[PDB]
Design a protein around this nucleic acid. Structure first.
Length: 534
RNA sequence: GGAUUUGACGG
């Protein structure tokens, strides 16, 4: 790269840093500058400085010039995509294409640009799939072929609370033929090559994204999943099942199998359950990686016979699982009993017995689950009662949120334990961003109204402080909604005392309006008669 | 306007 080329692209960049140029002129300049990359796309896109300018040009230009750049760079696209800088240039080209998805006039021009890219990739895909940078480019490209532009953490595939909520039970048409063509190229390697794509972090990530994009496309899922699992009616022979089972503790493969189980059609799921997982459930649940596969398996069980097999292998070991930091397995099994309507009472009672070994300790089931890690990690479990000031346990509180969705017939120990907690522990729970969710789930349960009222009364004197919390303010709302006139007035009176500070907060204005705190202060008789009418 | 599992990811 000569200094004339450097100066040219740097001067373009400075020209955009100044806003002397209007939007229409800018996109024309972006297109002219792309022409200066012809015949040296690789050198410019992989330059550690100019790559950034090229990103700006690709996202600022119009569709025709973008497609011309993609067409002219296609023969070097894999090398660009596998470069530490060039990969961001490649992804900027994809993001820029994605901005035209909503334009129906753009369909065939986009499809042709995707074809030129997919064809060079399919010709030689395996090192790109395993490449730290190339794997990102491929994920984005797969998403674009599906027609999704909006980056989703889950698609790429990070954790998200939405995926946890889905696991715990709490669109543009795209270019379907291009997605199928690209993915089939990624999968047409030998069974032995596939065995190592399974355990390579970057190819596993590519295949995870592809499987998520194929959700509900059962005829494609039934073709692609047997290729990934090397077991090409869907049947897993005994020796292949052994190899799948033996790789389940690998960090890369375990993430892949989580996604397989999430998208698997019924027949394919049932075969994996029977041939791979059955009789190994507890061993896999104690492994630092495979236990997340078991969580996915549990969450997607299909019928009551499977629920019975899962309960027999795992419920006797609820205590072990909680002791060893595997509470998500327990949470998944409890949640799916609720969905499959099977073993509900057995799951709730097994959880109590796992946490409370003696009859007398059962009154403490709520505190111990709220602080699950402190209780199981403490020096002397016979004297532990609380963890003053500590942040409550996320998965323990999610378990409790699921508990309070059962029929009250199944969870009497939990209702009694929660409503028995003394005022200071209940207020501490309400002030916790996880504990507040437990209280709200109880308030929404079919526990008796007198039991709800008993708990709400023990929050009296603290509604003002709670309203100032971002999380606690929702709890004030839901207490208020569940109250009679007398307690609504008490809550309204407490918010009145902190009305100045409360209006400063993000939630304050909405809380003050929903409870009509101004009307209570100014016309209390009219406020009460409107409240008593609700 | 709200916490988000115990095991991965970039010039």
């Amino acid at each position: 790269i000569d200094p004339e080329t450097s100066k040219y692209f740097s001067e373009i960049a400075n020209l955009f840093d100044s806003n002397e140029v209007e939007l229409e002129e800018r996109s024309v300049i972006c297109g002219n500058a792309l022409e200066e990359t012809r015949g040296r796309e690789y050198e410019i896109a992989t330059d550690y400085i100019i790559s950034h300018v090229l990103q700006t040009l690709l996202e600022g230009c119009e569709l025709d010039q973008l497609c011309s750049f993609i067409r002219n760079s296609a023969s070097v696209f894999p090398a660009i995509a596998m470069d530490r800088s060039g990969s961001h240039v490649a992804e900027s080209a994809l993001k820029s294409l994605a901005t035209h998805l909503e334009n129906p006039d753009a369909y065939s021009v986009i499809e042709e640009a995707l074809h030129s890219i997919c064809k060079v990739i399919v010709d030689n895909p395996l090192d790109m799939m395993c490449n730290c940078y190339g794997s990102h480019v491929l994920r984005r490209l797969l998403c674009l072929c599906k027609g999704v532009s909006l980056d989703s953490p889950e698609l790429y595939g990070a954790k998200s609370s939405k995926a946890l909520a889905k696991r715990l039970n709490l669109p543009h048409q795209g270019f379907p033929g291009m997605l199928t063509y690209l993915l089939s190229g990624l999968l047409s390697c030998s069974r032995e090559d596939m065995k190592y794509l399974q355990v390579d972090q970057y190819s596993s990530l590519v295949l995870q994204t592809a499987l998520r994009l194929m959700l509900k496309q059962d005829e494609q899922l039934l073709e692609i999943i047997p290729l990934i699992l090397r077991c090409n009616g869907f049947h897993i022979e005994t020796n292949v099942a052994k190899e799948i089972l033996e790789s389940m503790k690998d960090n890369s493969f375990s993430h892949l199998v989580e996604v397989i189980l999430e998208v698997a059609p019924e027949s394919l799921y049932n075969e994996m359950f029977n041939k791979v997982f059955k009789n190994s459930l507890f061993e896999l649940s104690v492994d630092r990686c495979a236990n997340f596969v078991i969580q996915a398996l549990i969450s997607h069980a299909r019928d009551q016979e499977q629920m019975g097999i899962m309960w027999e292998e795992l419920a006797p070991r609820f205590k072990d699982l909680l002791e060893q930091g595997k509470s998500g397995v327990v949470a998944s099994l409890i949640a799916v009993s609720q969905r499959l309507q099977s073993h509900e009472n057995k799951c709730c009672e097994a959880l109590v017995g796992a946490v409370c070994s003696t009859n007398e300790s059962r009154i403490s089931i709520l505190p111990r689950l709220l602080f699950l890690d402190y209780y199981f990690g403490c020096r002397d479990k016979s004297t532990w009662e609380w963890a003053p000031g500590a942040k409550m346990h996320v998965m323990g509180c999610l378990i409790l949120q699921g508990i309070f969705k059962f029929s009250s017939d199944h969870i009497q120990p939990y209702i009694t334990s929660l409503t028995s907690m003394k005022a200071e522990y209940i207020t501490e729970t309400a002030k916790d961003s996880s504990g507040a969710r437990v209280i709200e789930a109880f308030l929404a349960s079919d526990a008796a109204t007198k039991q709800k009222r008993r708990l709400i009364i023990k929050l009296r004197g603290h509604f003002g402080e709670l309203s100032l919390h971002t999380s606690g303010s929702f709890t004030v709302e839901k207490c208020f909604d569940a109250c009679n006139l007398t307690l609504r007035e008490a809550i309204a009176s407490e918010l009145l005392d902190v009305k100045v500070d409360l209006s400063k907060t993000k939630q304050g204005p909405y809380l003050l309006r929903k409870l009509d705190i101004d009307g209570y202060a100014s016309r209390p008789d009219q406020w009460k008669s409107r409240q008593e009418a609700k």
